Amino acid sequence: GGEQGATEALQGRVDEYDALRADVDDNASSIAALNDLTVLLN
């Protein structure tokens, strides 16, 4: 454990590197669901 504790210790300090808010999104984009009934009745 000279070889073991020493060894065990990180075998042969994890440092998370993280990432990013992958979700971009844009749904809103005046979803056609507004002017689809403009003048349903002409």
Place this chain on the structure above:
Amino acid sequence: GGEQGATEALQGRVDEYDALRADVDDNASSIAALNDLTVLLN
């Protein structure tokens, strides 16, 4: 630190497992925002 260094060393080797580009997306899908004005004026 026989118990301490040995101990300290990873107490009792972090290996990140990562994930995936969760964002699937499809927005484009000919967003109705193209043929919503086909013949607004009949």
